[PDB]
Design a protein around this ligand. Sequence first.
Ligand SMILES: Cc1ccnc(C)c1NC(=O)Cc1cccc(Cl)c1
Ligand SMILES: Cc1ccnc(C)c1NC(=O)Cc1cccc(Cl)c1
Lengths: 304, 304
Amino acid sequence: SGFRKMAFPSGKVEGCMVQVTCGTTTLNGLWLDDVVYCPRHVICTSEDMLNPNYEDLLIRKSNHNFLVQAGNVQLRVIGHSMQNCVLKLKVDTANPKTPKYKFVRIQPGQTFSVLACYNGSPSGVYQCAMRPNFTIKGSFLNGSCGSVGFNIDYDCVSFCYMHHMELPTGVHAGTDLEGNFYGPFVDRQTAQAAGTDTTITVNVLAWLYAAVINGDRWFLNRFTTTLNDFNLVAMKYNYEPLTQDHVDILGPLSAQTGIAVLDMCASLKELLQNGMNGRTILGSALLEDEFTPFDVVRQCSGVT
Amino acid sequence: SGFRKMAFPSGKVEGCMVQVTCGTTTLNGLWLDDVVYCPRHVICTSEDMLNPNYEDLLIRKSNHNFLVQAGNVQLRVIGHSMQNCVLKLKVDTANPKTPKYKFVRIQPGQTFSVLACYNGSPSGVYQCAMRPNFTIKGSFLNGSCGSVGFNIDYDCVSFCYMHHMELPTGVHAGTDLEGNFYGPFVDRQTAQAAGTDTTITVNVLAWLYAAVINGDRWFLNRFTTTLNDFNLVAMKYNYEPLTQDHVDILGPLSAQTGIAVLDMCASLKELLQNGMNGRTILGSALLEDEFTPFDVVRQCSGVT
Ligand SMILES: Cc1ccnc(C)c1NC(=O)Cc1cccc(Cl)c1
Ligand SMILES: Cc1ccnc(C)c1NC(=O)Cc1cccc(Cl)c1
């Protein structure tokens, strides 16, 4: 029993973190096999960041300008290339601590763990969701650039995020491991609009099922609804429209609890229209959307 | 910017986790140097747990009855001893992945990271506080026994908790690494009272300072209070009494923000008496007490 915002064990990712320095800028890199991946803005000075011409800036750099250090040992850079917003520094040594890994581009609403790093050293780990608007509400300071997000399936780490930037609004933007930004963002010191965000409906429902499994049941009611009626309420409260694909993914939790998905939707509808009346659910006074249906089943079944 | 319930990177602790089996019971052990530490109730059957005589049960066991497996390799047990509620199994091999470590008994109100494990395999990591009543509100299922809590200072892991039991109320009880329970709990299948819990006042104040640093300032007011007046409010709302020792530990955050500790106490007083009026602080609709003043300074300064 109990329900926590649990992160994946970060060990396999800690063994990949390195420090990358170019000129006067230092950030984090990810060392997998004989390649170090890092945000391409490591090649910028503060003056460059206003409107950088990355192609021109990278041409002034040679392999010996990229200083890569793994803990205390220096890596020898034998190649460099830019792929979208990431730099790939080929090194002469394969990382002996490289776990089994994949590069994945996650969908909005999916969750992942972030290993926050500074100067190539891990400081902490936390779980978060990629917002529907492709931002993440992380905890990152200057120097955290290059910190990565990931999921783990037994022995395989799927890297899904690399941190690049903090928007003027204090929310975070980054790329997949091929350097493609999530969202409309560009790696430039300019004010950039993050779209209207919404609450991840399927995750809130998954978390209400986790609440029932763990004993918090006060919000269950004698009502039911339809997908259409529920979506009228979801639109009014800036929630993502619920689809049959979302209902299908909630099936295991519906089966485990015996509460039909549309009955849980009716509980959520009443919570949206009436608030929590000063009560809590799983220690929260708001509707939590950072747990996917997969996360709930994993945490509630003890998958290692 | 941003503020998350961040856990320490779990890598150094993952390398210590082992599976311990005795008879038909399997749980987690902590392998440090040539000793494996685990909850002594690994020697019990379900029938024994009602009122176990651990001394008598342990006498029926020999070194060869304790099966210790580190991933896929079997450890050879050359000694066994009970210290309070933990068993110490001496093995013939020192753990090559033993980090620099200490065993510490933490105070109520302090925080730590938990690496939840099943069958000696890490499933997730989360941050939590030891409640004033010496329970923890974790996320643990059957088989999580032996999972540990810890803090990390640069390269040193201070182990402070080992999970033993879930109380009938769904909250968790465990020991320090010398096997001494935190709180009045006994390792027995009996209903056990956890005392009245309170909110960790100094942590809520630390978190209000983190909110100010990160831009959430709506709760700041034009008022101040005294320790005496604040403590009358704290008593009414089941908050721990604030002392000058607590004020002194909040000094760095008071200096960083320019908000005197008693002025922050007046904001907290108004939040206690008036609620949050449907607003949030750092993404929470309640007053958070799982961040110590040290945690706030660490997260806000990027200590690795
Ligand atoms: C200051 C800070 C705080 C938290 N995370 C981060 C990542 C930062 N740093 C930046 O955003 C620097 C920067 C400026 C403009 C564009 C880009 Cl790609 C990077
Ligand atoms: C079932 C469960 C769930 C979460 N954590 C845990 C630790 C459990 N298991 C138990 O509590 C088993 C047990 C019963 C009586 C005394 C003791 Cl020391 C241990």
